[PDB]
Scaffold this motif. Structure first.
Motif, PDB file in Angstrom:
ATOM      1  N   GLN A   1       0.774  -1.137   0.040  1.00 10.23           N
ATOM      2  CA  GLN A   1       0.077  -0.061   0.153  1.00 10.23           C
ATOM      3  C   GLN A   1       1.034   1.391  -0.209  1.00 10.23           C
ATOM      4  O   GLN A   1       1.956   1.288  -0.117  1.00 10.23           O
ATOM      5  CB  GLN A   1      -0.844  -0.100   1.271  1.00 10.23           C
ATOM      6  CG  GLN A   1      -2.160  -0.014   0.967  1.00 10.23           C
ATOM      7  CD  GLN A   1      -2.871  -1.278   0.812  1.00 10.23           C
ATOM      8  OE1 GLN A   1      -2.672  -2.142   1.608  1.00 10.23           O
ATOM      9  NE2 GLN A   1      -3.539  -1.373  -0.332  1.00 10.23           N
ATOM     10  N   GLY A   2       0.330   2.451  -0.011  1.00 11.25           N
ATOM     11  CA  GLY A   2       0.961   3.821  -0.072  1.00 11.25           C
ATOM     12  C   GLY A   2       1.800   3.828  -1.439  1.00 11.25           C
ATOM     13  O   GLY A   2       1.496   3.105  -2.286  1.00 11.25           O
ATOM     14  N   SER A   3       2.577   4.809  -1.538  1.00 10.87           N
ATOM     15  CA  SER A   3       3.230   4.956  -2.780  1.00 10.87           C
ATOM     16  C   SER A   3       4.858   5.302  -2.791  1.00 10.87           C
ATOM     17  O   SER A   3       5.096   5.617  -1.803  1.00 10.87           O
ATOM     18  CB  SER A   3       2.535   6.106  -3.669  1.00 10.87           C
ATOM     19  OG  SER A   3       2.229   7.144  -2.608  1.00 10.87           O
ATOM     20  N   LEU A   4       5.184   4.822  -3.933  1.00 10.89           N
ATOM     21  CA  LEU A   4       6.869   4.804  -4.134  1.00 10.89           C
ATOM     22  C   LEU A   4       7.063   6.216  -5.023  1.00 10.89           C
ATOM     23  O   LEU A   4       6.132   6.238  -6.068  1.00 10.89           O
ATOM     24  CB  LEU A   4       7.238   3.801  -4.690  1.00 10.89           C
ATOM     25  CG  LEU A   4       8.880   3.527  -5.093  1.00 10.89           C
ATOM     26  CD1 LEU A   4       9.536   3.577  -3.720  1.00 10.89           C
ATOM     27  CD2 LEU A   4       9.080   2.259  -5.608  1.00 10.89           C
ATOM     28  N   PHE A   5       7.744   7.247  -4.849  1.00  3.03           N
ATOM     29  CA  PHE A   5       7.802   8.362  -5.833  1.00  3.03           C
ATOM     30  C   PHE A   5       9.128   8.917  -5.764  1.00  3.03           C
ATOM     31  O   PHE A   5      10.143   8.452  -5.085  1.00  3.03           O
ATOM     32  CB  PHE A   5       6.602   9.365  -5.462  1.00  3.03           C
ATOM     33  CG  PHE A   5       6.626   9.706  -4.186  1.00  3.03           C
ATOM     34  CD1 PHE A   5       6.443   9.157  -2.987  1.00  3.03           C
ATOM     35  CD2 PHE A   5       7.183  11.026  -3.824  1.00  3.03           C
ATOM     36  CE1 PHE A   5       6.262   9.681  -1.801  1.00  3.03           C
ATOM     37  CE2 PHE A   5       7.278  11.838  -2.725  1.00  3.03           C
ATOM     38  CZ  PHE A   5       6.923  10.943  -1.677  1.00  3.03           C
TER      39      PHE A   5
END
Ligand SMILES: [Mg+2]
Length: 664
Positions: free
Chosen positions: A239-243
């Motif tokens: 879940q959440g994000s990679l950026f």
């Protein structure tokens, strides 16, 4: 697949992480901090002259010396791997935000197709044989401690006296501690002996990172760096994000009124952790002997010093392949941690010590400040070490853990793609030990010189050789990953431990040489990681004790680079146009100055004597003590210089200690 508990600084579990003293309390609340680095007494990294100097030199060098790297990633000619824009960063200012550290990397490994554990019995024998060759005939040694160094999480003390105390008490109680753990009493072991708790995350900078000058726009662009936010980190990516963190810098203008010339950026930040000293001491008493053995008995593949200590080896090979591995530390597998603990038990080893070791590689992590207004949070529950973050930078034996994985990964890569005829030598543990031993001593048709994620794979004449060329072409096509354990490829511009392997027209190790990476000298001199700290008196407790001495060793270290002199000139010139000053003159004075001061420390240097009896390595080290953590070691430096940076616990106490853990 498990979210991983998270606790805020207010939670009690976070509070037990910091003793009741000022430094600890302040370390737990340290907020995001930013500021121009003091590159040299009196010069700020963001000084408009300096930035200007940087712009001219970065473009001149790029333009006069474009890289000479063939398609098989070998560098030849000028010995340049890439452009010189790497220095275009506003040093003490970080990208934002830094990444949150991943609590679990099991999924990261799966989505990258890396394995669960040994893929075959042979591989299982090998990893295991390595543990036996490395932990078998250890000889006690004084436990050495770095003078600057912090005790981390429990007390955050820097006083040597207190460090010696903690260490000694730790070797005495290490055993009740591991037993408490063996019964699952982590909290007791932590409350009674401060063994357990958490690693303390600190974000360190990478002064230079990689900037590109787009020709379509004439404007620079920085290499995006991916980072995970909280959600991403606590769920292993579910879940959440990679950026991409922003390296922009323009903000330095509205925020600090600082001038940011075109094409300059915030430097990247990489997470770094300090483990709890009470737990590391029991671990370092084993790790130093283990280093000693592998640098002695297996000096061939593991011990490297001089650029020529390397050529001697690579020159004999008929094909040298220089590898590169992606994200070593966060991909490093917990299953290897488990396999290792399992072997140690099998070979004897106090089970309370192994319990200690396993636990240090599963500890929770406490994050300070990856970004303004962000997290002072504990990831993981200390009551039950659960993290699978894959290799903590501050665990007592990070280098060992990485070297052991990898060294074997390359071997498997060689056996798998070039020497199947060697497979029959590995039938059971004895044969595996016997083989691995022979292999690390450099006695086989396939060789290796390596250290953690940096390696040089080798092939002499033989059946393995024709394969090997295939392996290499496999890597050049970059379509199939050659290993089941880590994402491996070839290094674009092969180099090993600082030194580049300069190839002539031939393109063969035998006629290739190991020179110094000029780009490094540049990074070292115009983008140090830390400022010079005039603030601290005791220069030994300073991140960069005698920056000035580097000038005395530059030659020895970077002299063979094909462009050495041309560079020193470009610098004198560009430096002159930015400071109407002479770098060199500037450097010699600094040289005299630190040379003179150095003598107040080496209690054996005739006051105003010179650098007379010192190693070029001695110089580089006294000028930059990290390096004693990634390039060289205790024995590579003179003993008179050693005491200036280190201090230790009596060999007597470690010996008493080792006896109780060692099988025999
Ligand atoms: Mg390399």
């Amino acid at each position: 697949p498990r979210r991983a508990p998270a606790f805020p600084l207010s939670d009690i579990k976070a509070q037990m992480l910091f003793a009741n003293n000022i430094k600890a309390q302040q370390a737990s609340k340290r907020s995001f901090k930013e500021g121009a680095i003091e590159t040299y007494e009196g010069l700020l990294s963001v000084d408009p002259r300096f930035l200007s100097f940087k712009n001219e030199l970065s473009r001149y060098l790029t333009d006069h010396f474009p890289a000479n790297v063939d398609e098989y990633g070998r560098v030849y000619g000028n010995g340049v791997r890439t452009n010189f824009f790497g220095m275009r960063h506003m040093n003490g200012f970080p990208m934002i935000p830094a990444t949150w550290p991943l609590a679990s990397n099991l999924k990261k490994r799966a989505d990258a197709d890396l394995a669960d554990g040994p893929v075959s019995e042979r591989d299982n024998l090998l990893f295991r044989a390595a543990v036996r060759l490395m932990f078998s005939d250890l000889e006690p040694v004084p436990l050495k401690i770095r003078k600057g160094s912090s005790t981390c999480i429990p007390y955050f003390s820097n006083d040597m006296g207190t460090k010696i105390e903690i260490a000694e008490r730790a070797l005495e109680k290490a055993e009740e501690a591991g037993n408490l753990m063996l019964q699952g009493k982590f909290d007791d072991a932590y409350q009674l002996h401060q063994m357990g708790g958490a690693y303390y995350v600190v974000y360190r900078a990478q002064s230079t990172d990689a900037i590109t000058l787009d020709p379509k726009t004439g404007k620079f662009v920085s290499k995006d760096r991916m980072v995970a936010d909280f959600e991403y980190a606590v769920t292993g990516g579910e879940q959440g994000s990679l950026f991409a963190a922003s390296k922009d810098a323009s903000r330095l203008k509205e925020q600090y009124g600082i001038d940011v010339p075109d094409g300059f950026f915030c430097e990247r930040r990489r997470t770094a952790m300090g483990g709890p000293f009470a737990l590391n001491a029991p671990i370092m008493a084993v790790a130093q002997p283990v280093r000693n053995k592998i640098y002695s008995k297996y000096a061939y593949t593991f011990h490297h010093t001089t650029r020529l200590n390397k050529e001697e080896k690579v020159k004999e090979w008929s094909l040298c392949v220089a590898t590169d591995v992606s994200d070593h530390d966060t991909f490093w597998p917990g299953w290897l941690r488990d396999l290792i603990c399992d072997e140690l038990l099998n070979m004897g080893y106090a089970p309370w010590w192994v319990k200690l070791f396993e636990t240090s590689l599963k500890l929770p992590v406490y994050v300070g400040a990856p970004a303004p207004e962000q997290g002072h949070t504990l990831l993981g529950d200390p009551s039950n070490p659960d993290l699978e973050v894959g290799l903590s930078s501050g665990q007592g034996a990070t280098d060992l853990m990485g070297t052991l994985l990898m060294s074997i990964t390359y071997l498997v890569m060689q056996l798998d793609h070039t020497a199947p005829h060697l497979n029959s030598r590995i039938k059971d543990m004895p044969s595996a030990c016997r083989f691995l031993d022979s292999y690390w001593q450099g006695h086989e048709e396939i060789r290796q010189i390596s250290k953690s994620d940096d390696a040089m794979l080798g092939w002499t004449k033989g059946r393995a050789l024709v394969g090997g060329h295939r392996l290499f072409e496999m890597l050049k096509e970059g379509k199939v990953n050659p290993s089941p354990y880590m994402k491996i490829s070839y290094e674009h511009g092969g180099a090993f431990l600082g030194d580049i392997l300069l190839y002539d027209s031939r393109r063969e190790p035998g006629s290739a040489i190991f020179v110094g990476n000029i780009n490094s000298m540049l990074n070292n001199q115009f983008s140090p990681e830390y400022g010079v700290q005039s603030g601290v008196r005791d220069r030994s407790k300073r991140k960069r004790p005698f920056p000035g001495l580097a000038w005395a060793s530059m030659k020895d270290t970077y002299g063979a680079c094909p462009i050495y002199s041309d560079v020193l000139e470009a610098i004198e010139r560009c430096w002159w146009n930015a400071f109407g000053e002479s770098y060199r003159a500037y450097r010699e004075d600094m040289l005299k100055r630190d040379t003179l001061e150095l003598s107040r420390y080496v209690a054996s240097m005739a006051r105003q004597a010179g650098l007379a009896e010192l190693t070029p390595i001695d110089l580089e080290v006294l000028a930059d003590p990290n390096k004693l953590q990634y390039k060289w070691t205790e024995a590579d430096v003179s003993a008179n210089i050693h005491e200036v940076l280190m201090h230790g616990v009596s060999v007597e106490k470690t010996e008493r200690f080792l006896r109780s853990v060692m099988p025999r």
